[PDB]
Amino acid sequence: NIADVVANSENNYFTMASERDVDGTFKLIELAKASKESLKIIPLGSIENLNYAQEEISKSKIEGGWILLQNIQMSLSWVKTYLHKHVEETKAAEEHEKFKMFMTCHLTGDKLPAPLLQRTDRFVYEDIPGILDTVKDLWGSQFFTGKISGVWSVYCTFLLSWFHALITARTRLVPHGFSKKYYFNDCDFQFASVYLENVLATNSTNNIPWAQVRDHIATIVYGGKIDEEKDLEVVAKLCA
Amino acid sequence: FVIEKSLNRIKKFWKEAQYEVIEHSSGLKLVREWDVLEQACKEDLEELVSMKASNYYKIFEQDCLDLESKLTKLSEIQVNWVEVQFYWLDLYGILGENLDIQNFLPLETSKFKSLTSEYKMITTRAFQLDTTIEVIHIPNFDTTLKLTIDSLKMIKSSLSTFLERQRRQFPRFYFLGNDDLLKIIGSGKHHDQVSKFMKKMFGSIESIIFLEDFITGVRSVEGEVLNLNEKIELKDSIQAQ
Amino acid sequence: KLNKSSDNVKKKIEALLVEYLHFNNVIGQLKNCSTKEEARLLWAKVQKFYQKNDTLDDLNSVFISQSGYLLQYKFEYIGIPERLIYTPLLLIGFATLTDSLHQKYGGCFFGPAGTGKTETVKAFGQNLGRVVVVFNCDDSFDYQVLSRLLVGITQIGAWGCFDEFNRLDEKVLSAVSANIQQIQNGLQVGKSHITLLEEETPLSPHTAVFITLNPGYNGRSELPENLKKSFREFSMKSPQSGTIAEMILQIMGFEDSKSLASKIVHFLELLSSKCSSMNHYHFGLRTLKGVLRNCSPLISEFGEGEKTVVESLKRVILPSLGDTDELVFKDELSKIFDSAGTPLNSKAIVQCLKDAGQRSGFSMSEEFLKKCMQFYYMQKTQQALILVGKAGCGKTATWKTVIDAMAIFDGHANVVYVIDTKVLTKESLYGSMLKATLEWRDGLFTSILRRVNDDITGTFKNSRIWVVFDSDLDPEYVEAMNSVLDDNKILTLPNGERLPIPPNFRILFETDNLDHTTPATITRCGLLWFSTDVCSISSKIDHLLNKSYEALDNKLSMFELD
């Protein structure tokens, strides 16, 4: 697992790549809480986050704490200009206080610099949870933020979590299931949940608006990405 | 003599080279074709520095050093001179051709007028020499060019800040380039050529309908006339923004 | 009321009829619903407008409701824009954009070119009373202007659309992606001020950014990874061409508009499937709309029947087709449609052509008359024309003969400037600027454009002007007159001032190849295609003999010559 390759290796640089479907940042959090803790999540992004990352990495290489960079695939430009040269200059991680650098990339993402990849240790995440595990995760994560409306909102959120799990399970099979590889991130689930809350608040506390709930979820929320009639009708029948 | 002839050719070329000038409508002497003599000076400097590599350099080292010093001074003169002319020519399009913009910026206009007078004096002094290499013998020629370029760049920065403030006053101006914005600002008493920029900053609206000194309404790109509720009154002192 | 109205109010009535046909369609759909639940379902998707009454604020008293989401209406003047027909796909696009905007997300449309993404964004802006500003990409377009425009959009709170966001250089792509991400994060989080263009500027919460992505070389183009989180993509399916054609024909007053629309769409898709694929063949929605628009001048000559549609299809589709596809077009027209093949207003002009060709020595064969007729009817509508063939087709003979015939017919003088576009440099054709003294030189095309506009002699008003670009055209040279080719019809010089072309100013491209021109140029210009030599192998010999005889007649006696 990630624990064995981290422990047995002597390099302080790791690149834990994965598919766009599933990310193993929770696995890295579990590894950190298992030993040495001191893990900071650094979400790459806008220029403010870019500067925060380029300062926090320099701080961590001295203080020795762990640090993780998510989605290098959306910050190649800074990686080529800063991370590549910084790792080249600090390839002697032993002279500095011992600290661990983690990069999460995408196998289907963009090309990464050859020296950076060859110097660092490499690892791949393939732990694809089952349908039930995804349902449990979605059900647990919703209620950490508290309740927003009546009980029907909870019931609809449960139904939507099951639907999201089924969709994500089907999207991993080709050409059976979905004829094309599609990625259904948490944004789709968030949008569908907000629409469900809106339709429950405005209309009534009854089971009446299902006819438009199914159509809106199938044709706009989860159907926006889809440009094939076969996949559209698959999503439509799943929603029905 | 294989080296003597090259040195003689360099001297002979620099004893005749002279910049071509064209008279400007403001009395200034504008230089055309900056590139030819600058390139000639740079190539001659490279030839002189490559001459030192040959072991026969001692015989003509004194002449080579004199030419090296003269050409380095000329290069330092030219680098500042070309860009001084460029900045002055850019700023004269903005200031000095429109009374209203001058009224908006009195300090900048005064500084630009002083710079124009000083640069005119310097250029008139330099162009009597009839040679572009003798200009290095004019005392404090380079320092005057440095002062002029610094003052022109500071004036340009002040103008840019003024334009940014003008845009922030009326955010629709961000759809107009600096040229168009200055054309609008300078149109103080006219306030009727602003309509040509309506399609650029207001989208559908194509022009304005002025009646006497009142804005009755605007018209779209399809010719549809929209009539305002209360006609806006315009004065001579009112700003375009 | 449309038929007895002035042109300015005709435009307004035509724009209103789209919405009233939409109302009729929605009411008819609601009538046929067998359940109250189905009626409510169908009514939810349709864009519903409301006016508040408890809110004193006048400018925010009207809001838009679709799928349960409410969007305010900003009372910005939009004029009388070309209204889009309310197809179900259009309503789904509106619903997607409303869904994205309710969360302060962005809106993204992707799909093959010609499905109506840019126009859908613009129409959604129009229906909310906003003027969506379009940011054309890779069109003489730098990044400083993008920064300025984005700052203006954020400060005034307008809506921005990045048309063709897939085609632009990678550096500016990344910089603009960073700026867009900053804007979108500022919108979602809600911070008053954002930092773009190295400056902290205020951000109006009503700002929105839309992006349209045409397909790439590989296939479906994708947003940059950073933007993928702040935008909601939406695939644009093939538009309901039948509904669009039916509503346009009904507005135009054509009888049996449903059958006519079905026949036009079926004919165009048959042409797409049957004709050999060529890079200049476009039978999409834009071509159908151009055919429908071109029917209006023909209404007075023929009427509002099917024959007008057939004649317009022959005016637009046919001249751009090759020799092997002309018979396919004729067969499909004879099959789907049924016309008598009798063109009106083609008797005096035909005689003028015959007189001009006889005077010039040419022989009026069937092919030559056909090509001259196609040129003459094409030049009425399009300002710029592209004559394509092989070396020796008869392009210059065709347009010289037609110009002479029109001079005889209309009585208008013709001034022809033949320009070889590839011999002269761009700096010599459009003029150049001296970077040392800022003295603008006119050039060649701009000089004659100035002469035409500044007709001090007063002759260019009562005469046609032709500028023929005899050499083969390339994208770089035509990029400097693309503004002339657009509906703007102004020559935008790099500096100095802008020159507007008069309606008399015609531009011809007597090229022989189309292997480099972008499809935008050929879809903005009337393309006439020569697939076979206009004259036979004996007509050319007779013409050359006549030319040599008239050359010799100047110095030889009559009896010896004869």
Ligand SMILES: Nc1ncnc2c1ncn2[C@@H]1O[C@H](COP(=O)(O)OP(=O)(O)OP(=O)(O)O)[C@@H](O)[C@H]1O
């Ligand atoms: N009706 C006709 N009868 C006889 N000869 C004709 C007729 N029409 C065209 N031609 C001949 O065909 C030629 C017409 O001009 P041509 O097509 O060669 O010019 P172009 O379009 O400028 O050139 P290119 O196509 O080679 O670039 C001439 O040689 C002319 O004699």
Ligand SMILES: Nc1ncnc2c1ncn2[C@@H]1O[C@H](COP(=O)(O)OP(=O)(O)O)[C@@H](O)[C@H]1O
């Ligand atoms: N719903 C519609 N009703 C009427 N015309 C439409 C509709 N959708 C698209 N069109 C026509 O299709 C043409 C091209 O669409 P466009 O928006 O240019 O596609 P893209 O965004 O892919 O470039 C436009 O001229 C427009 O008139």
Ligand SMILES: [Mg+2]
């Ligand atoms: Mg478009």
